[PDB]
From Swiss-Prot:
Significantly inhibits the growth of Gram-negative and Gram-positive bacteria. Disulfide bonds join Y3-Y16, Y7-Y12. The modification Arginine amide is found at R17. Hemocytes. The chain holds residues 24 to 40 of 77 of the full protein. This is Tachyplesin-1. It is found in: Secreted. Belongs to the tachyplesin/polyphemusin family. It comes from Tachypleus tridentatus (Japanese horseshoe crab).
Length: 17
């Protein structure tokens, strides 16, 4: 399962898959 945002001060990342 993905996340939603998280990234905080990172860069979201491949949330789609």
């Amino acid at each position: 399962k993905w996340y939603f945002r998280v990234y905080y001060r990172g860069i979201y990342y491949r949330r789609y898959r």
